[PDB]
Amino acid sequence: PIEYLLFEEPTGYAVFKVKLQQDDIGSRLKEVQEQINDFGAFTKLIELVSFAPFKGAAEALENANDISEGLVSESLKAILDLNLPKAKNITLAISDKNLGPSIKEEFPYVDCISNELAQDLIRGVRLHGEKLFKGLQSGDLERAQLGLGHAYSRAKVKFSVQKNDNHIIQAIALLDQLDKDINTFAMRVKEWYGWHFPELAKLVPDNYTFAKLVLFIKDKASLNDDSLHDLAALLNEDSGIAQRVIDNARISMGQDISETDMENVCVFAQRVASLADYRRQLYDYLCEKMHTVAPNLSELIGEVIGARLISHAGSLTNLSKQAASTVQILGAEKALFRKNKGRISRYLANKCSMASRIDNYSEEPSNVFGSVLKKQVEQRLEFY
């Protein structure tokens, strides 16, 4: 007595019309069951009659929920209204019994079915999937299922980017990478310009300064009192390097390199300057995120140190998980926490573990507890 079948897709809602009714008495016969597997037989039973794809990602989740709590969405109401005739009562087959009463309320003239016969067809519809859509645009169900999957899940758990801490792990890995590469290039700039003016590399040991100074002094021959004041403005004259570079540039040993060579020194020196500037920018980005992600842990030990501990555990969830002893050895390879000295390290390790659990497991952690815990550590520090 079934005529219409309601099915739901991640892309949208699909309605089917039952052309032929399978034998109900012999439902459990192998021969009827084999037909459900067989596409050719199944197409004789039903035919796809409607499909209305969801407008976007947001609608699918809203309907995905509304199906979950056994509710009818506006989208579902529109489709059923257009397809189901008013009619004694048209019979609709549905997977969920809970959706039954909801459908009956909105449409008094429809009778829902969720018996094994309905389940048997619903299984066949889901078995063949897009093959029954007869070329209609239903995208790819497997990916759309993936599209809705965590989307449905994270919603119930109320997952948010705020709890996300991977940004910290990426930042630390990048920051150390930047520091190594800034150093490696800056040395090459020293070698490159060292040929043209070796003494200057000795004068300004600070590599970042040296790149800036080389950018101004591209040619050591160019020496003017005004230029001396300019390079004097760079850093300070307390070291006296401003006078030394003028005197050294006058009497220095470096063989003059080509204009193309000097072009690259400043260009390469420009590259080192940008990375250090970005590294400073990323360092600040790390600093604020800890105050947002782990206000307690950062406030106890520090933003950078706390980040390194989290990276060692692999996630803030991992760090909160480990026992106090494990946390102590977690940063025992770089002396993050560092006989009386060892006692404080063990003491601090517990309070670091004390805090990590607070931050991870609080949706919006505060720093009120982090402050007092450090004050507790400070009292211990004075006592020992």
């Binding site: 109401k77 209204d81 257009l82 397809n83 189901l84 005739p85 008013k86």
Partner: peptide
């Protein structure tokens, strides 16, 4: 059979249908 061309609800399902029919009763 259900047809889009003739309204099958017998009451205005969409809030638009509420607003328009109000004028039609009002107009004449």
């Amino acid at each position: 059979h259900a047809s889009a061309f003739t309204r099958t609800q017998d009451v205005p399902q969409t809030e638009l249908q509420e607003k328009v029919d109000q004028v039609l009763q009002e107009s004449n």
